[PDB]
Design goal:
mainly beta, binds chloride ion, SH3 type barrels, Tyrosine-protein kinase Lyn, monomer
């Protein structure tokens, strides 16, 4: 549902591997592709790409 859309981190996360994106609570990311539990994303702040745990983020356009 979120490919191409903007999510915000609910919780911070420090990457443990090079393919992970590290982020802070409140950081905005574009979802590049969903792959189940982990999504590939781009930080709108740093422009870096990597995988993120989807249960750390929520859609920015919430009701
Ligand atoms: Cl990073
Ligand atoms: Cl940000």
């Amino acid at each position: 549902g979120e490919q191409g859309d903007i999510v915000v981190a609910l919780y911070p996360y420090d990457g443990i591997h090079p393919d992970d994106l590290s982020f802070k609570k409140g950081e905005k990311m574009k979802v590049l592709e969903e792959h189940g539990e982990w999504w590939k994303a781009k930080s709108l702040l740093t422009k870096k790409e990597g995988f993120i745990p989807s249960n750390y983020v929520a859609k920015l356009n919430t009701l």
